[PDB]
Design a protein around this motif. Structure first.
Motif, mmCIF file in Angstrom:
data_model
loop_
_atom_site.group_PDB
_atom_site.id
_atom_site.type_symbol
_atom_site.label_atom_id
_atom_site.label_comp_id
_atom_site.label_asym_id
_atom_site.label_seq_id
_atom_site.Cartn_x
_atom_site.Cartn_y
_atom_site.Cartn_z
ATOM 1 N N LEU A 1 40.793 30.962 31.138
ATOM 2 C CA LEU A 1 41.387 30.749 32.567
ATOM 3 C C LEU A 1 41.069 31.117 33.899
ATOM 4 O O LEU A 1 40.325 32.536 34.378
ATOM 5 C CB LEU A 1 42.827 31.905 32.244
ATOM 6 C CG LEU A 1 43.759 31.201 31.520
ATOM 7 C CD1 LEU A 1 44.282 32.907 30.500
ATOM 8 C CD2 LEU A 1 44.662 30.373 31.723
ATOM 9 N N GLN A 2 40.298 29.485 34.495
ATOM 10 C CA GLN A 2 40.079 30.190 36.027
ATOM 11 C C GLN A 2 40.946 30.489 36.977
ATOM 12 O O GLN A 2 41.544 29.604 37.788
ATOM 13 C CB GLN A 2 39.397 29.004 36.432
ATOM 14 C CG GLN A 2 38.177 28.418 35.129
ATOM 15 C CD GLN A 2 38.576 26.741 33.853
ATOM 16 O OE1 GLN A 2 40.106 27.391 33.828
ATOM 17 N NE2 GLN A 2 38.047 26.486 33.802
ATOM 18 N N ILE A 3 40.298 31.528 37.438
ATOM 19 C CA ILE A 3 41.472 32.249 38.796
ATOM 20 C C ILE A 3 40.794 32.484 39.950
ATOM 21 O O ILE A 3 39.833 33.070 39.912
ATOM 22 C CB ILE A 3 41.896 33.728 38.148
ATOM 23 C CG1 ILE A 3 42.833 33.259 36.373
ATOM 24 C CG2 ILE A 3 43.455 33.879 38.963
ATOM 25 C CD1 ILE A 3 42.653 34.604 36.296
ATOM 26 N N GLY A 4 41.340 31.587 41.682
ATOM 27 C CA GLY A 4 40.758 31.420 42.320
ATOM 28 C C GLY A 4 41.439 31.706 43.247
ATOM 29 O O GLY A 4 42.858 31.866 43.161
ATOM 30 N N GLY B 1 39.688 37.541 41.642
ATOM 31 C CA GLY B 1 39.085 35.991 40.609
ATOM 32 C C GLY B 1 38.778 36.314 39.176
ATOM 33 O O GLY B 1 37.972 36.938 38.483
ATOM 34 N N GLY B 2 37.874 34.746 39.267
ATOM 35 C CA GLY B 2 37.053 34.644 38.203
ATOM 36 C C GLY B 2 37.528 34.207 37.032
ATOM 37 O O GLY B 2 38.088 32.813 37.331
ATOM 38 N N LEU B 3 37.836 34.206 35.709
ATOM 39 C CA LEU B 3 37.254 34.155 34.620
ATOM 40 C C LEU B 3 37.397 35.254 33.763
ATOM 41 O O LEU B 3 37.617 36.396 33.470
ATOM 42 C CB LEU B 3 36.155 33.480 33.924
ATOM 43 C CG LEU B 3 36.305 31.943 33.335
ATOM 44 C CD1 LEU B 3 35.727 31.183 33.194
ATOM 45 C CD2 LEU B 3 35.876 33.538 31.332
ATOM 46 N N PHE B 4 38.962 34.535 32.942
ATOM 47 C CA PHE B 4 39.486 35.273 32.208
ATOM 48 C C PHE B 4 39.565 34.478 30.476
ATOM 49 O O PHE B 4 40.093 33.479 30.537
ATOM 50 C CB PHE B 4 40.794 35.541 32.512
ATOM 51 C CG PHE B 4 41.323 36.884 31.260
ATOM 52 C CD1 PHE B 4 41.115 38.175 31.332
ATOM 53 C CD2 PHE B 4 42.580 36.010 30.441
ATOM 54 C CE1 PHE B 4 42.026 39.184 30.567
ATOM 55 C CE2 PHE B 4 42.873 37.899 29.677
ATOM 56 C CZ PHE B 4 42.272 38.666 29.531
ATOM 57 N N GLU B 5 38.839 34.895 29.257
ATOM 58 C CA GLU B 5 38.648 34.019 28.269
ATOM 59 C C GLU B 5 39.504 34.648 27.496
ATOM 60 O O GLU B 5 39.277 36.280 27.308
ATOM 61 C CB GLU B 5 37.288 34.367 27.678
ATOM 62 C CG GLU B 5 37.492 33.247 26.403
ATOM 63 C CD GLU B 5 36.297 32.308 26.459
ATOM 64 O OE1 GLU B 5 34.951 32.841 27.107
ATOM 65 O OE2 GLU B 5 36.200 31.075 25.366
ATOM 66 N N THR B 6 40.525 34.216 27.001
ATOM 67 C CA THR B 6 41.843 34.853 25.878
ATOM 68 C C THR B 6 42.638 33.556 24.851
ATOM 69 O O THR B 6 41.877 32.140 25.266
ATOM 70 C CB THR B 6 42.979 35.705 26.064
ATOM 71 O OG1 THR B 6 43.693 36.787 25.601
ATOM 72 C CG2 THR B 6 43.722 34.500 27.628
ATOM 73 N N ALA C 1 42.636 24.077 32.741
ATOM 74 C CA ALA C 1 43.647 25.717 33.253
ATOM 75 C C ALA C 1 42.419 26.688 33.844
ATOM 76 O O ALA C 1 42.941 27.565 34.480
ATOM 77 C CB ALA C 1 41.976 26.941 31.640
ATOM 78 N N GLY C 2 42.575 24.881 35.189
ATOM 79 C CA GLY C 2 42.840 25.914 36.518
ATOM 80 C C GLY C 2 44.077 26.688 36.575
ATOM 81 O O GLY C 2 45.107 26.220 36.627
ATOM 82 N N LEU C 3 44.379 27.738 37.575
ATOM 83 C CA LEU C 3 44.760 28.125 38.466
ATOM 84 C C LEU C 3 44.764 29.145 40.348
ATOM 85 O O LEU C 3 43.699 30.140 40.146
ATOM 86 C CB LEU C 3 44.818 29.238 37.218
ATOM 87 C CG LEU C 3 46.531 29.700 37.814
ATOM 88 C CD1 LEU C 3 47.302 29.588 36.760
ATOM 89 C CD2 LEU C 3 45.926 31.736 37.065
ATOM 90 N N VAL C 4 45.312 28.220 40.488
ATOM 91 C CA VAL C 4 44.792 29.032 42.177
ATOM 92 C C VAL C 4 46.190 29.183 42.382
ATOM 93 O O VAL C 4 47.305 29.320 41.617
ATOM 94 C CB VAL C 4 44.799 27.852 43.312
ATOM 95 C CG1 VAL C 4 43.256 27.116 42.496
ATOM 96 C CG2 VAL C 4 45.451 26.998 43.375
ATOM 97 N N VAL C 5 46.526 30.368 43.493
ATOM 98 C CA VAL C 5 47.416 30.916 43.993
ATOM 99 C C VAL C 5 47.740 30.503 45.444
ATOM 100 O O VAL C 5 46.914 30.898 46.546
ATOM 101 C CB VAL C 5 46.799 32.828 44.239
ATOM 102 C CG1 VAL C 5 47.879 33.194 44.250
ATOM 103 C CG2 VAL C 5 47.262 32.552 42.326
#
Ligand SMILES: Cc1cc2nc3c(=O)[nH]c(=O)nc-3n(C[C@H](O)[C@H](O)[C@H](O)COP(=O)(O)O)c2cc1C
Ligand code: SF4
Ligand code: FES
Lengths: 493, 148
Positions: free
Chosen positions: A326-329, A335-340, A400-404
Motif C-alpha cells: 500500500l503506497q501512501i503519499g 508516507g511510503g510503503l506498507f506491505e501487508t 494500491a495507490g493511496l493519497v490524502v
C-alpha cells in the motif's frame, strides 16, 4: 563504520547526494574507516535519507539526514537528535509482513552476492527442475489474480497463453505506473531488481517463451538504468533459463499502460487502444501469444513457487489472497510503503499507522487507486482493503495507490483535474474520451459558475462515458467526479 | 554531420523488433528533437512511410517537435503532488522565471510531467535530469539560483 546511504530517487531527491558529500568531507577531515553503502529505500520516505549505521545489535537508523546534521555524527550515535534505534524495530516497519519487498532496502541492489545470500535465485533454480505445467498449477493454486486491474487470476492467463501454438511466444512486464501515489514498482526495480529478472525468467520458462520485455516509463529515469544494469549483470543467470530480456522505455503516455496500447507501442506503432475480439493472450505482440503482467505480479511468482503456494494463500480475505503493498503519499505524516495482507481498514492505515497529515489538519479525502479512483472520505474508514468489497462499495483498488487531502483542499478543483487528465491523457480512439472529457471539463466550469442544467448533464455524460468508452481511462474517469460530487456536496454549488 | 549520426543510430538499431520507438529516442537524445529532415530516412530503413513515422512522433509527448531551452523544469500536476501544494510552488517559480505553465523560452521550459514516483515527497520537480522533492517556497530559491 559502515554507512548505508540510499541510492533511491526518494533519497536523491531529498538530497542524499549532499549527505554523501558531507559525510565523505567530514571523514576526510576526521580520520575514520569511511565505509559507504548504496542500498535502496526501506519503504519509509518520511525519513528516506536515513543513515543506517552497523552495530553488533543490528543497524541503527537516523532521521531525514540533512548535511547540516552530518557533523553530529562521529561524536556520539546515542546522543544524536535524529535517533530511531533499530530501523527494523520501528512500529512502521514492524507491522509490515513485507514479503515481496523483503530484500529491498537491506542490500546493495546491483550486488549478486547479497542477493544470492538472501535466498535469491532460488525460485528460478527451483523452477527449471519443474515442468511448464507444474509451475502453472502452482501459480493457480495460490489465486494471485491481477494487481493492476480488477484482478484476473494469472494462473488462468498463463494457462490460456500456454494452450496456444506459435513459433515464438512473448512475455511483457507492464511497469508503466503513471498513476499517482503508485511508486512501488519504482522501488522494487530500483531496489531488489533481480527479483523482477527472476520472476520474468520463471514466467517465461513456464509459459513457453524465450524472448521477454520490460516496459519502463520515461518519468522513471533511474529505474531504467538500474534495470538495464541488472539485465546486463544477470546475463549469466539468464543464460541457464534460456531467456533474453530487454528494457523498452516508454515515450510519455499514461494510456500506454493498457495491455493493448502497451503491446501496440512495443510494435513500433502509435499507442491506440485496440478493440477486444482477440485477447493479447491469444493474439498479442506481432500477432503472437504474449503474457502481459504487472511487476508486483511477476515479483511474487518466484516467492510463490519457492516458499510454497500454500503459504501465499494464507494471507488475505476469502476471495483475495496474498500480500499487497500500500503506497501512501500526499498530505500525510508517515508516507511510503506498507506491505501487508488484505482485510485491513484504511482507517487504521491512514489514522493510526501513517498518523494524520503533514499540515496537522484533518483529512477530508482519501483516494484509492490513481485518478481513476473514487474519493473515499473519513466515513469509509470501516472498509477493509480487498478487491471485491471495494469494487462493491462504489470504488476501485488497483496498484494500491493511496493519497490524502486535508480540509484545505477543494473538491471542485480535483473533479476538474480528473477530466483534465482524462483529456490530456487520451489516445483518441473512441469518442466518449476524445470529446467527452474536453466537454466535461467545460461542464464542470459551468457547474462552478452556478448553472443547474449542468449537473444532470454531467450525470448523463458520466454515464455514457462509463458505458461507452473503449478502455478504463474514460470508463473510470467518471468515478472521481461522481464521488467528489456525492461525498462532498458542500463544495459543489 | 546529421546524416552521419542518423545513419549510425539506424545501424545501431538494425534487425530489432519494433525498433521505431528506440530509434526515435536515440534521435531525440542526439539532437534534441525529431527533425522533419529525419522522418524519411527512418521510414526507409525501417520500411515504413513518412506518415507513420510522423504519427508516432505526434502521439508521444516525450518526442519534442522543437528544441527546449538551456534548462528544463518539469513539475508534477497529479493528485498527490497537488495535495501538498504544487500550485504554490508553480506560481512562485513561474513568477521567478516569468514563464507560465507550458510557456517555453530560450532560457528555460516550464512543463508538466504528472508523476515522478516522488509521491510521498509530494512536491516534486525534475530540473535537468535532477529530481527534487519537498519543494517548499524556499527550495525554489536554490532551484533558480543554480538555474540562470
Ligand atoms: C489507462 C490504464 C493504465 C494502466 N496502467 C497500468 C500500469 O501502470 N501498470 C500495470 O501493471 N497495469 C496497468 N494497467 C492495467 C493493464 O491493462 C494490465 O491489466 C496489466 O498490464 C496486467 O497486470 P496483472 O499482472 O496485474 O494482470 C492500466 C490500464 C489502463 C486502462
Ligand atoms: S476512452 Fe479515451 S483513451 Fe480509452 S480507448 Fe477511448 S479514446 Fe482511447
Ligand atoms: S504524483 Fe506527482 S509524484 Fe507521483
Amino acid at each position: 563504520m559502515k554507512i548505508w546511504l540510499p541510492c533511491d530517487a526518494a533519497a536523491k531527491a531529498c538530497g542524499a547526494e549532499a549527505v554523501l558529500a558531507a559525510l565523505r568531507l567530514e571523514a576526510e577531515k576526521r580520520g575514520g574507516a569511511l565505509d559507504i553503502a548504496r542500498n535502496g529505500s526501506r519503504g519509509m520516505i518520511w525519513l528516506e535519507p536515513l543513515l543506517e549505521v552497523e552495530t553488533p545489535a543490528g543497524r541503527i537508523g537516523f532521521g531525514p539526514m540533512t548535511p547540516a546534521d552530518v557533523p553530529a555524527l562521529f561524536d556520539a550515535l546515542e546522543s544524536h537528535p535524529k535517533a530511531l534505534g533499530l530501523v527494523e524495530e520501528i512500529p512502521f516497519f514492524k507491522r509490515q509482513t513485507r514479503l515481496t519487498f523483503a530484500r529491498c532496502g537491506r542490500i546493495e541492489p546491483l550486488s549478486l552476492a547479497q542477493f544470492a545470500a538472501a535466498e535469491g535465485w532460488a525460485g528460478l533454480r527451483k523452477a527449471l527442475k519443474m515442468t511448464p505445467a507444474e509451475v502453472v498449477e502452482e501459480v493457480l493454486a495460490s489465486g494471485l489474480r491481477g494487481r493492476g486491474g480488477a484482478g484476473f487470476p494469472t494462473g488462468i492467463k498463463w494457462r490460456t497463453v500456454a494452450a496456444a501454438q506459435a513459433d515464438q511466444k512473448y512475455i511483457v512486464c507492464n511497469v508503466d505506473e503513471g498513476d499517482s501515489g503508485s511508486f512501488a514498482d519504482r522501488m522494487l526495480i530500483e531496489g531488489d531488481p533481480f527479483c523482477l529478472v527472476e520472476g520474468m525468467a520463471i514466467a517465461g520458462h513456464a509459459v513457453g517463451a524465450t524472448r521477454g520485455y520490460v516496459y519502463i516509463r520515461s518519468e522513471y529515469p533511474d529505474a531504467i538504468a538500474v534495470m538495464r544494469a541488472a539485465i546486463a549483470m544477470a546475463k549469466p543467470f539468464l543464460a541457464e533459463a534460456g531467456f533474453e530480456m530487454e528494457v523498452r522505455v516508454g515515450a510519455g503516455a499514461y494510456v500506454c499502460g493498457e495491455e493493448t496500447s502497451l503491446l501496440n507501442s512495443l510494435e513500433g506503432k502509435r499507442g491506440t487502444v485496440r478493440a477486444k475480439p482477440p485477447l493479447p493472450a491469444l493474439k498479442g505482440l506481432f500477432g503472437k501469444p504474449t503474457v502481459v503482467n504487472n511487476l508486483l505480479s511477476l515479483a511474487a511468482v518466484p516467492w510463490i513457487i519457492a516458499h510454497g503456494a500454500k503459504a501465499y494463500e494464507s494471507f488475505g480475505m476469502d476471495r483475495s489472497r496474498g500480500t499487497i503493498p500500500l503506497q501512501i503519499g500526499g498530505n500525510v505524516k508517515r508516507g511510503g510503503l506498507f506491505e501487508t495482507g488484505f482485510g485491513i481498514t484504511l482507517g487504521e492505515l491512514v489514522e493510526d499507522i501513517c498518523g494524520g497529515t503533514a499540515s496537522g489538519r484533518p483529512v477530508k479525502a482519501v483516494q484509492v487507486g490513481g485518478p481513476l479512483g473514487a474519493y473515499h472520505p473519513v466515513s469509509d474508514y470501516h472498509l477493509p482493503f480487498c478487491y471485491e468489497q471495494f469494487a462493491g462499495q462504489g470504488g476501485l483498488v488497483g496498484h494500491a495507490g493511496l493519497v490524502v487531502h486535508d480540509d484545505t483542499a477543494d473538491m471542485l478543483k480535483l473533479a476538474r483535474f480528473a477530466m483534465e487528465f482524462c483529456a490530456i491523457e487520451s489516445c483518441g480512439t473512441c469518442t466518449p474520451c476524445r470529446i467527452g472529457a474536453v466537454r466535461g471539463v467545460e461542464v464542470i466550469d459551468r457547474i462552478a459558475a452556478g448553472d443547474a442544467s449542468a449537473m444532470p448533464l454531467l450525470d448523463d455524460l458520466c454515464q455514457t462515458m462509463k458505458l461507452g468508452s473503449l478502455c478504463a481511462l474514460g470508463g473510470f474517469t467518471p468515478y472521481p467526479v461522481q464521488s467528489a460530487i456525492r461525498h462532498f456536496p458542500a463544495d459543489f454549488p | 554531420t546529421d546524416t552521419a549520426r542518423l545513419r549510425a543510430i539506424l545501424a545501431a538499431h538494425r534487425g530489432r523488433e519494433g525498433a521505431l520507438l528506440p530509434i526515435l529516442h536515440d534521435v531525440q537524445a542526439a539532437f534534441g528533437f525529431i527533425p522533419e529532415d529525419a522522418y524519411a530516412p527512418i521510414a526507409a530503413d525501417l520500411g515504413l512511410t513518412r506518415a507513420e513515422v510522423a504519427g508516432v512522433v505526434g502521439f508521444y509527448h516525450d518526442f519534442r517537435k522543437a528544441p527546449a531551452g538551456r534548462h528544463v523544469i518539469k513539475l508534477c500536476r497529479a493528485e498527490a503532488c497537488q495535495a501538498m501544494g504544487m500550485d504554490a510552488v508553480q506560481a512562485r517559480l513561474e513568477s521567478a522565471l516569468g514563464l507560465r505553465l507550458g510557456d517555453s523560452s530560450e532560457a528555460v521550459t516550464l512543463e508538466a510531467v504528472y508523476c515522478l514516483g516522488l509521491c510521498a515527497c509530494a512536491p516534486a520537480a525534475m530540473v535537468d535530469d535532477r529530481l527534487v522533492g519537498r519543494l517548499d517556497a524556499a527550495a525554489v530559491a536554490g532551484i533558480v539560483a543554480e538555474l540562470g
